[PDB]
């Protein structure tokens, strides 16, 4: 059984910062790329950011590109995201997901295999 558990923040004021983290278990953490997918309360899914399994390569959507930092710690099986300048438009559920990329000696991915349940981030 694979689990991804978000242990995120809560309600924050606009212009501040909020850090999310996700703990992973049930699989070799270091074998998979991970990403964050966002869902506004009334909307569909949006890809936000992607990080390589060795933590070296990160990608973002333009809308958060100068504001978000995605990171990784393979010794603690932890995925994290540090968000800055918190727009009200960033209110959403942030889901921890496994997949979205491979390491070019591996079979391809470009889809997500596992999902956490999501942290709710609210910006006033």
């Amino acid at each position: 059984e694979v689990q991804l558990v978000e242990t995120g923040g809560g309600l924050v004021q606009p212009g501040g910062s909020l850090k999310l983290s996700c703990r992973a278990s049930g699989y070799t953490f270091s074998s998979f790329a991970m990403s964050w997918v966002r869902q506004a309360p009334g909307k569909g899914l949006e890809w936000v950011s992607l990080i390589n399994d060795r933590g070296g390569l990160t990608f973002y959507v333009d809308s958060v590109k100068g504001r978000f930092t995605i990171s990784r710690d393979n010794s603690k099986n932890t995925l994290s995201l540090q968000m800055h300048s918190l727009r009200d438009g960033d209110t959403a559920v942030y889901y921890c997901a496994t997949g979205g990329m491979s390491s070019a000696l591996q079979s391809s991915k470009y889809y997500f295999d596992f999902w956490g349940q999501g942290a709710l981030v609210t910006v006033s």
């Binding site: 491979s102 070019a104 000696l105 391809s108």
Partner: protein
């Protein structure tokens, strides 16, 4: 979908024959303080002693060094003259009858217009009963090549030599304690240079080599083929104590402008035969172990018999070795006279020779200066060389020195590193 990706520094290799260089503590590379052995946890590789070219290089380098050491030494050509040989004026036991002769001759000296009378003692084996003129006997090798005297300052101690790989190459070592010389070896490690191997030259009993880790190991190219030798490695040493119990007085003369010849002048005390001592029980236990292992290759409900060599000259019918600079030829029939069916010691008589050929060659001889005083040495028997004729009969062999070297190099293989290679990946330019 997939693309060719080129990788350089790939950890692969092929069997190869290349030039190895030596290291040591007349001289080559200083001994490397750390061989840096790498375990290679999941590498299994195939080894094949007898097809191992490291043996041939060791063979050639040892012989070459031997010859180089004699280049600056005195050539005893003025001594190929008729001799006048009679018996020795001393107390000579039956085992020495007759074995030694008192020979006089006219030697050259520093000036060409001068000549001198010299007499010395010779072993019967170094002279031939010819001439039949005014005189009796000549030196053994004045009908083949001229003798060169070994320089008295040069010892024949078997100083170990390490064999090191050139860049681009590696030596793989087999660590399987039960390895019989061929086939897959499940535990292989990489080394930069081999351990030092002592260039001990002997025949039927291998001296001062490596011992088997756990059990006696019998290695042969083809065990059922009587044309092949059987190399038996012991897991325990057998100690052998050798002596030449005669106190020699050694004298020298000049035979030319800076050329000094050495000879035995006389013997102090009684004259007795040289000999070697092998503990009896130890030897009997050693053979019992060898027999147990032979029974795994031959029928089990069998008889194993040991016998002495049936023929050939002194070089192969005896146990030849260097003891303190003297060359001994010991009779081993006292060791190999038994049949094995489903504080005592053994004394081996030894003959001594001063004029030897060392290698199986025709065009070279060497004179070993006699040594002042009395000689004693102790060596370890670490293996045997046997040949095979119900009842299987085994006899001592070992005439070809390559086999001595095979008994130490059997665990090493040379491979060439091939760092470039390709494999499919998803990556494209």
């Amino acid at each position: 979908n997939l693309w060719v990706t080129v990788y350089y520094g790939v950890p692969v290799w092929k069997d190869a024959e290349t030039t190895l260089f030596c290291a040591s503590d007349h001289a080559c590379v200083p001994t490397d303080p750390n061989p840096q052995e790498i375990h290679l946890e999941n590498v299994t590789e195939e080894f094949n002693m007898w097809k191992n070219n490291m043996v041939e290089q060791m063979h050639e380098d040892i012989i070459s060094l031997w010859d180089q050491s004699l280049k600056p030494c005195v050539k005893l050509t003025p001594l190929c003259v008729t001799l006048q040989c009679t018996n020795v004026t001393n107390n000579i036991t039956d085992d020495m009858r007759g074995e030694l002769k008192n020979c006089s001759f006219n030697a050259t000296t520093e000036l060409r217009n001068k000549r001198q009378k010299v007499y010395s003692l010779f072993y019967r084996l170094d002279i031939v009963p010819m001439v039949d003129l005014w005189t009796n006997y000549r030196l053994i090798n004045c009908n083949t090549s001229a003798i060169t005297q070994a320089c008295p300052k040069v010892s024949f101690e078997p100083i170990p030599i390490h064999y090191c790989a050139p860049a681009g190459f590696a030596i793989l070592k087999c660590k399987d304690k039960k390895f019989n010389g061929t086939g897959p070896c499940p535990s292989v490690s990489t080394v930069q240079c081999t351990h030092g191997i002592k260039p001990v030259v002997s025949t039927q009993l291998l001296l001062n080599g490596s011992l088997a880790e756990e059990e006696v190991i019998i290695r042969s190219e083809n065990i059922t083929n009587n044309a092949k030798n059987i190399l038996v490695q012991l897991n325990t040493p057998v100690q052998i104590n050798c002596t030449r119990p005669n106190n020699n007085t050694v004298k020298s003369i000049r035979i030319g402008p800076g050329q000094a010849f050495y000879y035995t002048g006389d013997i102090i005390g009684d004259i007795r035969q040289a000999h070697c001592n092998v503990s009896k029980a130890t030897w009997n236990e050693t053979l019992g172990k060898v027999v147990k292992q032979l029974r795994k290759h031959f029928g089990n409900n069998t008889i194993i018999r040991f016998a002495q060599s049936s023929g050939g000259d002194l070089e192969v019918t005896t146990h030849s070795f260097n003891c303190g600079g003297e060359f001994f030829y010991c009779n081993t029939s006292g060791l190999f006279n038994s049949t094995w069916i489903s504080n005592d010691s053994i004394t081996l008589p030894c003959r001594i020779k001063q004029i030897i050929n060392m290698w199986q060659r025709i065009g070279q001889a060497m004179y070993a200066p006699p040594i002042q005083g009395v000689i004693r040495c102790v060596s370890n028997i670490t293996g045997l060389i046997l040949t095979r004729d119900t009842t299987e009969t085994f006899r001592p062999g070992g005439g070809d020195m390559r086999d001595n070297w095979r008994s130490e190099l059997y665990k090493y293989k040379v491979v060439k590193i091939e760092p470039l290679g390709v494999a499919p990946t998803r990556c494209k330019r």
